[PDB]
Amino acid sequence: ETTALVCDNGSGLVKAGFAGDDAPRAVFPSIVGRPRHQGVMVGMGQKDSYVGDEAQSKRGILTLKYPIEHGIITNWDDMEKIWHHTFYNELRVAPEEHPTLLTEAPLNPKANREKMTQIMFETFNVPAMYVAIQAVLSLYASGRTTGIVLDSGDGVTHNVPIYEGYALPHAIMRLDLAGRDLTDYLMKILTERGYSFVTTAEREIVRDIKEKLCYVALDFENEMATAASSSSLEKSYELPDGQVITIGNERFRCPETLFQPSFIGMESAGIHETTYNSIMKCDIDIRKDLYANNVMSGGTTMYPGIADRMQKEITALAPSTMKIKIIAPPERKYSVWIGGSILASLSTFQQMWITKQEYDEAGPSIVHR
Ligand SMILES: Nc1ncnc2c1ncn2[C@@H]1O[C@H](COP(=O)(O)OP(=O)(O)O)[C@@H](O)[C@H]1O
Ligand SMILES: [Ca+2]
Ligand SMILES: [Ca+2]
Ligand SMILES: [Ca+2]
Ligand SMILES: [Ca+2]
Ligand SMILES: [Ca+2]
Ligand SMILES: [Ca+2]
Numbered sequence: 001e002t003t004a005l006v007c008d009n010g011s012g013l014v015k016a017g018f019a020g021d022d023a024p025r026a027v028f029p030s031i032v033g034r035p036r037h038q039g040v041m042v043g044m045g046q047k048d049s050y051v052g053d054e055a056q057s058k059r060g061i062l063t064l065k066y067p068i069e070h071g072i073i074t075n076w077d078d079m080e081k082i083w084h085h086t087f088y089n090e091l092r093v094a095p096e097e098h099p100t101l102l103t104e105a106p107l108n109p110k111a112n113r114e115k116m117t118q119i120m121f122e123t124f125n126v127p128a129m130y131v132a133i134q135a136v137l138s139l140y141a142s143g144r145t146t147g148i149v150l151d152s153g154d155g156v157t158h159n160v161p162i163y164e165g166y167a168l169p170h171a172i173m174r175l176d177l178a179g180r181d182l183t184d185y186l187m188k189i190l191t192e193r194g195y196s197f198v199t200t201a202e203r204e205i206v207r208d209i210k211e212k213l214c215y216v217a218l219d220f221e222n223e224m225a226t227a228a229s230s231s232s233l234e235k236s237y238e239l240p241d242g243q244v245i246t247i248g249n250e251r252f253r254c255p256e257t258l259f260q261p262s263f264i265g266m267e268s269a270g271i272h273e274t275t276y277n278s279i280m281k282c283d284i285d286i287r288k289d290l291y292a293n294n295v296m297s298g299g300t301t302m303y304p305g306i307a308d309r310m311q312k313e314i315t316a317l318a319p320s321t322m323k324i325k326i327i328a329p330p331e332r333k334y335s336v337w338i339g340g341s342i343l344a345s346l347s348t349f350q351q352m353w354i355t356k357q358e359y360d361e362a363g364p365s366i367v368h369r
Pocket of ligand 2: 009010011134153298336
C-alpha cells in the first residue's frame with residue numbers, strides 16, 4: 001500500500017489520477033466504440049474496441065456506446081474497457097499496486113456497487129478499494145459534511161441533500177439534462193442566425209464557445225430586454241477556418257435551459273425548483289442547514305452568474321426569514337475527484353479501505369454501509 005488511485009466515473013468524462021494530486025491527470029470521454037463488421041474490425045487494426053477520443057474519431061464506422069450515460073453504469077463489458085483504458089493507457093499504472101477509490105452516482109443500486117467491486121478485485125486485481133457517492137465527495141471538497149449539493153455534469157443533474165455525511169435517498173432529485181444537452185442546444189440556436197453547426201467537428205467548436213462565453217442571466221426576460229442597447233453582450237469568436245462569428249443572447253439563452261427545461265422540450269422542473277423540492281422532502285429540522293449550505297458541483301455549474309441566480313430563485317421559494325447561501329468553489333468542475341483525492345490520501349484511515357482479503361472472506365455485502 002503506497003499511492004492510492006482515484007477514478008471518478010462520469011456520465012460523459014472519466015476523471016482519474018493519484019490521491020494527493022490537486023486535479024486529475026487523466027480526463028477522457030466515457031465512450032466505447034465497437035466495429036459492426038469483422039472486415040472493418042480487421043481493416044482498422046484488429047482492435048475489438050476503442051475508448052474515448054479514439055472512439056469518437058471513428059464515429060459513423062464504430063457503434064458508440066455511453067455505458068454511464070445517465071450516471072449509472074449499465075454495461076459491464078464496456079465499463080471494463082473504460083477502466084482498462086484508465087489504468088493502462090491513461091495513467092499507465094499496474095492496478096495491483098494501488099488501492100483504488102471509485103465514485104458512484106446518487107441512488108446507485110447495491111447490486112451495481114457489488115459488480116463494480118467484483119470487477120476491481122477479479123479483473124484488475126487491486127489490493128484494496130472503496131466506493132464513495134459523488135455528491136458526498138463534492139461536499140467534502142467544500143469542507144462540510146452537511147449540505148445540499150447541486151451536481152450538474154454531462155448527461156445528468158442531481159440534487160442531493162446530505163446530513164453529517166449521509167445522502168438522504170428519499171429526497172434525491174434527478175434531472176436528465178446537463179452539459180451534453182446544453183452543447184446540442186447551442187448548436188441549434190446558432191444555426192438559427194444563419195450559421196451552420198452540425199458536424200462532429202462543429203459540435204466540438206460549439207462546446208468550446210459554450211465553455212468560454214456562456215453565462216447565466218439573473219433574469220432571462222430582463223437580460224433579453226437589455227440586449228439591444230448593451231455594449232458588452234456581443235462577443236466575437238474565431239472559428240477554425242478563420243471566419244469570426246458574433247454571439248449575443250445565445251450566451252445566456254443556452255444555460256437558461258437548466259432553469260427552464262421547456263427550452264429543449266422537457267416538462268421537468270428547473271434546477272432551482274428541484275433544489276427546493278429536495279429540501280422539502282427532508283426533515284423540517286435540518287432544512288435551515290441545507291438552505292445555508294447549497295454547494296454547486298460539476299462542469300455544468302461553471303457558468304458565471306449561476307450562484308447569484310440560484311440565490312435569487314431559492315430566496316423566492318423559501319420562507320422569508322431563511323438564511324440562504326450558495327457555495328460555488330472555483331475548482332468545482334473537478335470537486336468530485338478532489339473530494340475522492342482528500343479521502344483516499346488519509347492514510348490514518350487506511351483501515352476503511354476494503355482489502356482483497358476482506359472481500360474474499362465477507363462476500364459482496366461488504367462494500368455497503
Ligand atoms: N467552463 C465550463 N462552462 C460550462 N460547461 C462546462 C465548463 N467546463 C466544462 N463544462 C461542461 O461540463 C460537462 C462535464 O462536466 P462533468 O462534471 O465532468 O460531467 P460528468 O461527470 O457527468 O462526466 C461537459 O458537458 C462540459 O462541456
Ligand atoms: Ca459526475
Ligand atoms: Ca484527455
Ligand atoms: Ca459546415
Ligand atoms: Ca423574468
Ligand atoms: Ca417533450
Ligand atoms: Ca478494511
